[PDB]
Amino acid sequence: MIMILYWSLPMILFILGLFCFVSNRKHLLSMLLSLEFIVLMLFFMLFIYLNMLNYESYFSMMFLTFSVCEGALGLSILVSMIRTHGNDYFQSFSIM
Amino acid sequence: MFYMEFILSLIGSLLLIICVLVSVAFLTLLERKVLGYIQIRKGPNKVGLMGIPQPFCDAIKLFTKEQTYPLLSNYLSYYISPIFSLFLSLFVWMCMPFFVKLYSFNLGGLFFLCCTSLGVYTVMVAGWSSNSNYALLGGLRAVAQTISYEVSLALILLSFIFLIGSYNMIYFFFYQVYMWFLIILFPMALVWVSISLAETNRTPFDFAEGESELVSGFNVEYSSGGFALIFMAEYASILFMSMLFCVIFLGCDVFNLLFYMKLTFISFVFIWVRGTLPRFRYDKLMYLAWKCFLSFSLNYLLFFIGFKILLFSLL
Amino acid sequence: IYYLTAKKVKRDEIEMRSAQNVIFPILVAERDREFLRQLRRNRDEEAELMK
Amino acid sequence: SLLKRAWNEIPDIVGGSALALAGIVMATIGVANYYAKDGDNRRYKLGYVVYRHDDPRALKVRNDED
Amino acid sequence: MFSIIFIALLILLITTIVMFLASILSKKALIDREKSSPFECGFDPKSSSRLPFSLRFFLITIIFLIFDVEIALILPMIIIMKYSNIMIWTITSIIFILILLIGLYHEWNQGMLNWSN
Amino acid sequence: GLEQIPDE
Amino acid sequence: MIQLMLYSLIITTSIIFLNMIHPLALGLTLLIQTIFVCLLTGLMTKSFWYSYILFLIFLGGMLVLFIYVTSLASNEMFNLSMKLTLFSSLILIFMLILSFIMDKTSSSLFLMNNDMQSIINMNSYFMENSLSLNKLYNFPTNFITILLMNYLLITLIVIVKITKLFKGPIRMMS
Amino acid sequence: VITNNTTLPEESELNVQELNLSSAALRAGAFHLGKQCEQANNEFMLCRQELDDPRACLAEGKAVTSCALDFFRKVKKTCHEEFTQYATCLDKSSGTMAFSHCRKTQGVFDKCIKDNFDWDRPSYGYFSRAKVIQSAREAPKKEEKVSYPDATPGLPEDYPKPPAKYGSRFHWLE
Amino acid sequence: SLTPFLRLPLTDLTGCLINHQTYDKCGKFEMKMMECFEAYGLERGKRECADLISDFQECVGMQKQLMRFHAMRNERYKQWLKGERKGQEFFADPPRVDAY
Amino acid sequence: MSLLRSKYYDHPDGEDAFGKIVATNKYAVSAGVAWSMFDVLTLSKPQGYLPTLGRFAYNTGPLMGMATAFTLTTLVATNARGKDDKINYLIGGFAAGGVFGAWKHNHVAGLCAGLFLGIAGVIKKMSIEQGWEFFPNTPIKQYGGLNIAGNDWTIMADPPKNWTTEKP
Ligand SMILES: COC1=C(OC)C(=O)C(C/C=C(\C)CC/C=C(\C)CC/C=C(\C)CC/C=C(\C)CC/C=C(/C)CC/C=C(\C)CC/C=C(\C)CC/C=C(\C)CC/C=C(\C)CCC=C(C)C)=C(C)C1=O
C-alpha cells in the first residue's frame, strides 16, 4: 500500500518508456527519444530517493551528465550509421 | 498566504503585460522613426498627428487582412506556434526586478535561460510547419544561431553572478549603489550586446528572418496575425534584453525615471546597431561564439574566480 | 570601488543576520510550547478516535 | 615567434590568457592570505552558536572590533 | 510556483484570445487554388521541404550538448564559495576551467570547430 | 504595536 | 490539488508518448512531459534548482534532435486517430474527477519542502541551495567531480573520433 | 511518534503569556533587546542544541519570554511614540525590513533609549559572533564507545606461525 | 552497505557518495548500524543487528510512521462512510502554523 | 492463502489428489508460458491476436496433459498397492510419454519420452525417499580467499572507530 501510494507511478511510466524503447519503430531516433523519456523517469525516481535524504541531491546532476553522454553516444552512433549506410532504418541494418 | 497578495500579483502582472505590449508598439514606432533618422530621411509623420498613431495603423491592418491557409503546411502546428512565441516573450517579463514583491524569483537567471531557450523553440517550430524551403532554412539558421550563442550566454551570465554572489537580480541593486557595472564589464558590455542581438535575432545576426539571403526567413508563410504575434514576440524580446542591459551594466533601481530613460536609450542602441553594421554569415557567427566569445568568457571567469577569492580573504 | 561596495553590502547582511539571531530564540520558544501543546492534543485525539 | 603570430591573428585569446594568468595569481594570493590568518575561524558565524567555557572551541573565538 | 503556473495559463489564454480575435476580424475571402501554395519565390517548388537536409555542423551540435551539461556543473559554485573549504573550491574551479580550455583549444587545434565541407 | 501588550 | 493534476497530465502524456510513431510527436510529447516532470520534481525539494537544471539539460538535448529529425526522417506522415483522443480525454476527465474526490493529505508526497521543515532546523535558515550543492565541491567528493571533468573530456574525444568531420555532411542516402 | 509511555507537560504549564508582537515591532529595538536578554537566550539555545528535546528547557523558554516581555514593558513606559515611529518606518520603508533604508528615526529612538536608560546600541555584528557563557546546569556526558565483546576476530600478528603439517595436504602435493 | 570487491584506491572517491552523515536526522542511527557493520561484518550484521537495521529503516524510510498515518486517515473516512462520524465534526481542530 | 498455493509434497503421496494436480499443473503452466513467451515472438511469429493464443494453448495444454496424466497415474499406482516405490513413478513417466506421443502423433517419441520421464521419476523418488536435495542451499560460501581483511588497499586514512572489543 505504501509502495502503491508513493512512487508506484514512475515504475509504471518507466515500464511504458521501456516498452516504447523496444517497440517496432521504423527509425533509431524514436528509440533515442524513448531513451530521453526513460532518463526523465529515472530522474524522477532518483529524485524521490535523493529527496528522502536531506542534503544528498548533489548526485542528481551526475546522473544528468552520464545520461547526456549516453545521448551523445547515441547521436554519434546515429552519425556513424550514415558513414556506412544511407539511412537509419532498423530493417536496413544486418540482423546477423 | 494573504488573499490580497494574489490579487495584486495578478493585477501587477496584467498591467505589466499590457504596458509591455503598448511599449512594443511604440518601440516599432521608435525604430521606424530613429532608423529613418539614422539615414537622412524622416520617420512616419503624416498619419495621425505627428506619426504617433502609426502603430495603430499597423495593428488595425494586420488584424483585418486575410489569414493564410497554406496548402502543404501542417496547419494545426502552424496556427499554434506564434501564440506560444508571444506567450514566452511575455512570460519572460515576470522575471523583472520589482522593488515591491511582484514575484520572488530567487533563480531569475535560470528562468531567463529557460525562456530564452523556449523562444527559439517557438521560432524553429514555426519555421518547420510552414512547409516552405525558405522557412525551413530560416528555422535551421535559428537553431544554428541558438546552438552558437547558448553556452556563451550562460557562462557570461555566471561571471556577472559571481560579482553578486546570488541568483536574485534585486541583489544587483545593492552591489551597484556606488557605481554602475559598465566600468568593470565593458568588454562584456560589448560581448553581451553581441549576444543580446543574437538572442533577439537582430542585425548583425538576422539569419532567422533574412530579407536578402532568404525571403523574410521563417516568416515567409505567416500573414495577418501570425506575423503580428511573431513580430511582437521579437520586439518584446528586444525590450527584455534592453532591460537586462540596464539591470546588469547600469543601475538596477526602478523608482527612478532615469532607469526607463536608460532603457529607452538601450533600445535606441538596439535600433542603432541595426542601422550601422552589415549582417554576418552564420558560419562566421558559429566561428565567433565558439572560438572567441566562449574562450573570453572562460578566461574572464577565471579572472573573476581569482578576484572573488582575493576579495573574500580581505573581508 | 566594487571592493568598497562589497564591504557595505557585507555590513548590511551582517546587521540583518544579527537581527535574525537576536529575534530567533523567542520564536523557537513559542514554537516548542505550541509543539508540546499540539502533541498533547494529537495524543488525546488519537486515543479518542482509535477506541 | 609564436607569441607574435598569436597576438596578430587571435589577440582576444592572448588578452584572455593574460586575464586568466592574473586571475590564477590573484587566486594564489587570496588563498595564501586566507590561510595566513585564521580564515577557517570566521568572525561572524551563521546560525546561533553557543559554546560552554570548558569547550575547546571557546578559546578560539575572536574578539575583534567591527 | 503555483502563482507562476496560473499566470502562465493566463498569458496562454490571453494570447489564444488575441489570435482568435485576429482570426475572427480577418477578411474572409474565398480560397484560391494557387493562393495556398508554398511561395518558393514565385515559381513551382520541384521539391518539398520535407526532403532531407544536409548537416554540416553535427560535431558542433554534439560538442554544444556536451558543453551545455558542462554548464550545468558550473552554476552551483556561486553559492558554494562562502560555505566550503577555500583550497578545495579553488582546486576544483581552476581545474574545471583549465580542463575546458584544454578541450576547446585542442579541438580548435584539430579544426573540429570548423563546419564539415 | 505596544498597545497589544497588557499593563502589569 | 496541483500535484494530482500533474500526476494526471503525466499519465495522459505517457499514454500519448507510448502511441506516437512520428518523431516530432514524440518530441512535443516529451516537451510537455519534461515541463510537467520539472514542476513535479520542484514540489519535492526545498529549493527549485534541479528543475531548472533539468530543463536546461532537456532543452539543450532535443535542440540537436530536431536537426537530426530534419536530416533523417524529415518526410513521414502524421496520422491522427479518434480512438487515442477519446481515450486520453476520458482518462483525463476521469482522473481529474478522481483527484477532486480524493483526500489530498493522503495523496501528498512525504518528502519535506522548505516550509515542511521545522523551525528548530538551523540549516533550513541558510541560503536555499547552499548545503544541497555543497558536496560537489567539498573534500570527500571533489574527486568524483574531477572524474566527471575527465569523463566529459573523454566523451568529447570519443565524439570527435566516431563522427569524422572530414568524411562530409550527413543526410539520407549520403 | 508519541505514545502513552512518553511524558508530556500539562496544559496548565504551557498557558503562560507569550510575546504577540509583529515582525516590524520585533525588528525595531532588536539590538537593544539582546543586550538585556543575553543570559536567557544563550542558556536556552545552548541547552536546546545539546539536549535536543522540547520538554527540556521549558523554564528557559519561560525566562526568554519573561525577559522579552520585561524589555517591552520598559520600552512601553518611556517614549512609546518613538518606538511606534521607528516600527512604522521599518514596516513601511522596504519589503525586507532593512535598517539602512531609514536611519533618522533609528537615531531618534536610540537617543531616547540613551536619555532614558543610558543604554547604547551595539554594533552591527554583535549577535552574529560565537557567544561563550558559563552555564548553571551541568553538561550532558559524552556517549561511551559501543562495546562488542563477541566481535568478528582475526588472526593476530603476534600469533605463532609454524610451518604447515604435511604441506598443502591437497592432492598429493606434499 | 555493500562491500568493495578487489578494493583499490579508486573506491576512496566512490565510498563517500551517498550517506546520511551530512546534516541528517537519521545518520547517527545509520552510524550505529555501520558500527556493527564494522564489528560483526556484512554477513553477521544481517542477523545480529536486526534492531539497529530496523530503527534506521523506519527512521529514513518512514514505513511504520506512514502506515500509522494512513491507518489514522482511513479509519476517519471509514467512520464517515459508516455514519458514526458527523460531516460537520469530520475533521478535528487544526494546529497553529507556528507549531512544528 | 488458497488451494493454488500448494506444493506436491505437502502431504504423503497418495493421500491428497487435488493439491498435487494444482501443483504439478502449476509447474506445467510456468514451463509452458515461459517457452511460449520465448516462442511466439522469436521463431514462427503468428502475426495475429488469435493465432498467438493458439500457439500459447499449443505450448501449454499438452504440458497440462503431461502433468495431469503423470499425477493421476502415480495416484492410481499408489492407491492400488500398499507399498510406495519407484516403478509407480516409472509408469507415470510412461503415461506422460504416451501423452507426448498423442501430442506429436509419433509412438517412438511416446516410448522414448516415457523411458526418459520414467528415469526422471525414479531419480526424483530416490531423492524424496533418500533425503538428498537436488538444489540445496549452499553450506560453504567463500566470499574470498585468505587475508580478505589484510588486503585493504586504500589511500585515505581511517578515522578512529566508535566501537571497542573491550568489556565495560
Ligand atoms: C540593382 O538590381 C536590383 C533591382 O533592379 C533594378 C530591383 O528592382 C530591386 C528591388 C528593390 C525595390 C523594388 C525597392 C528597394 C527596396 C527597399 C529600399 C527596401 C529597404 C527598406 C526597408 C527594409 C525599410 C527600413 C526598415 C525599417 C524602417 C524597419 C521597420 C520595418 C517594418 C516593416 C516594421 C513595421 C511592422 C510593424 C509595425 C508590424 C505591426 C504590428 C504591430 C503594430 C503590433 C503592435 C501592437 C500594439 C502596439 C498594440 C497591441 C496591444 C494589445 C494587443 C493589448 C492592449 C490591451 C488593452 C486593454 C489596451 C533590388 C533589391 C536590386 O538589387
Ligand SMILES: CCCCCCCCCC(=O)OC[C@H](COP(=O)(O)OCCC(C)C)OC(=O)CCCCCCC
Ligand atoms: C507552457 C509552459 C512553458 C514552459 C515553462 C517553463 C518554465 C521554466 C521551467 C521550470 O520548471 O521552472 C520552474 C519554476 C520554479 O519557480 P521559480 O523558482 O522560478 O520561482 C519561485 C516562484 C512565485 C516565488 C516566484 O516554475 C515555473 O517557471 C513555472 C512554470 C509554469 C508552467 C505552466 C504550464 C504547465
Ligand SMILES: CCCCCCCCCCCC
Ligand atoms: C593552479 C592552482 C591555483 C590555486 C592554488 C592554491 C594554493 C596556493 C598556495 C597555497 C600555499 C599554502
